[PDB]
């Protein structure tokens, strides 16, 4: 019985990267050719394991993490990367054993005048550890002066909205991302 | 190897304008907020305003509202100030200074200064002059108008020289500051004790609050030494 990936892949709504979605699935089969040839994928890399032996593998559960980021932020979804996404939103460990799938979804996730739904984290005191999630909304203090919840100079709201206009360059257009973690 | 290098002295005739610069190096430019501090008649320190190099965010002290514009150039890791319809007031010494957060609070690195010629909280420094001898203990007070709980710093101005941070966060010593400088205070009244006064401690000592903007200074306390 192959795994039920359409529930996370074909889901009509995706989550922001800062409140990224985690779905576990148990006791099933993951074939590489069966899902590579599933659709139009702009990013499909597998670390740790080998794609060809994906269904020669045994594991307890599979966590299918999923979120929406923008095109030139997909390269951050990798081990040992850095930047706003991989430091404040979704860190992958250095020993990651699994896969990263991405694809363009301007047509789904962009609205004329903007799709102000998908958010991302812009600041944080410290670097997320692998698979840590944070949806706190505290005023990020950037200087010595305390913020006190009141926004202003060196006192920023930690979250911003993507533009996600269908007019933007593919560079800064919505991308659907699913991360398959095997443990 | 932190270095804040400002532009040279500017002599400009009244009503004109001039753009001084602060070329930084030795650290990652975009990671630390930058401030400008004005030192003029009365020989006292006036916070001028800040700029965040990462987003170009600004905050202006509203005394000088419209007197200057703060910009940065990430291409050359440089902070600029652009002055505006100068009077005789504007003749002063302007320092650029780096916010230390999160490692050291307040202004942990200053520049050499540029001599240009042509509900606020009030830090009050009782004595404008003290005299001890070497090896004596001396203390210096500041009274803040409001509550500023431990968000106070102490600076050292040796003659002809930029201020150097001594105490930050009311009681913590900056990197390289001798043990005979201890800070004490909380809430509104703060003291700076120099315990074993050395020859080289002759200087002006300023307090500063950084609880809210604008940042504000005391008037200073000249400290003078004598012994033979």
How many beta-strand runs of chain B?
22
- Whole-number count of domains of chain B: 2
Tell me the Rg of chain B in angstroms: 17 Å
Major β-sheet annotation of chain A? 5 strands, antiparallel
Helicity range of chain B: under 10%
What kind of assembly state do the chains in view correspond to? heterodimer
What spatial form of chain A do the alpha-carbon principal axes imply? Answer: globular
- The number of distinct β-strands of chain A equals 9
Instruction: Specify the structural class of chain B.
Output: mainly beta
CATH superfamily of the largest domain in chain B: Immunoglobulins
Which two protein chains have the largest interface (Cβ within 8 Å of the partner's Cβ), and how many residues from each?
A-B, 11 and 19 residues
CATH architecture of the largest domain in chain B: Sandwich
Silhouette of chain B: globular
Region (Receptor-binding motif) (chain A): 104-175
Glycosylation sites (chain A): 10
Region (Disordered) (chain A): 122-157
Disulfide bonds (chain A): 3-28, 46-99, 147-155
């Amino acid at each position: 019985n192959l795994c039920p990936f359409g529930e996370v892949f074909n889901a009509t709504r995706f989550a922001s990267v800062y409140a990224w979605n985690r779905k576990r699935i148990s006791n099933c089969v993951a074939d590489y050719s069966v899902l590579y040839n599933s659709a139009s994928f702009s990013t499909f890399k597998c670390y740790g394991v080998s794609p060809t032996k994906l269904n020669d593998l045994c594991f307890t559960n599979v966590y299918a993490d999923s979120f929406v980021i923008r095109g030139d932020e997909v390269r951050q979804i990798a081990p040992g990367q850095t930047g706003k996404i991989a430091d404040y939103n979704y860190k992958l460990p250095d020993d990651f054993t699994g896969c990263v799938i991405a694809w363009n979804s301007n047509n789904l996730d962009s609205k004329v005048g903007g799709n102000y739904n998908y958010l991302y984290r812009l600041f944080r005191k410290s670097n997320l550890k692998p698979f840590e999630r944070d949806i706190s909304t505290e005023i990020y203090q950037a200087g010595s002066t305390p913020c006190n919840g009141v926004e202003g100079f060196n006192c920023y709201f930690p979250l911003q909205s993507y533009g996600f206009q269908p007019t933007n360059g593919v560079g800064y257009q919505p991308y659907r991302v699913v991360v398959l973690s095997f443990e | 190897e932190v270095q804040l290098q400002q532009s040279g002295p500017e002599l400009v005739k009244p009503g004109a304008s001039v753009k001084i610069s602060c070329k930084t190096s030795g650290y990652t430019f975009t990671e630390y907020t930058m401030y400008w501090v004005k030192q003029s008649h009365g020989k006292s320190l006036e916070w001028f305003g800040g700029i965040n190099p990462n987003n170009g965010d600004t905050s202006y002290n509203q005394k000088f509202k419209g007197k200057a514009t703060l910009t940065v150039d990430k291409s050359s890791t440089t902070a600029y100030m652009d002055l505006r319809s100068l009077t005789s007031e504007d003749s002063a010494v302007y320092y650029c200074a780096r916010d230390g957060y999160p490692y050291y609070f307040a202004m942990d690195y200053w520049g050499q200064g540029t001599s240009v010629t042509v509900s606020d909280i009030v830090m009050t420094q009782s004595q404008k002059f003290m005299s001890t001898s070497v090896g004596d203990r001396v203390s210096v007070t500041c009274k803040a108008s409001q509550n500023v709980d431990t968000n106070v710093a102490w600076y050292q101005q040796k003659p002809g020289q930029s201020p150097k941070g001594l105490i930050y966060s009311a009681s913590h010593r900056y990197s390289g500051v001798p043990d005979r400088f201890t800070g004490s205070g909380s809430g509104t009244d703060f003291t700076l004790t120099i315990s074993n006064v050395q020859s080289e401690d002759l200087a002006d000592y300023f307090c500063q609050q950084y609880n809210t903007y604008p940042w504000t200074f005391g008037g200073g306390t000249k400290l003078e030494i004598k012994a033979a």
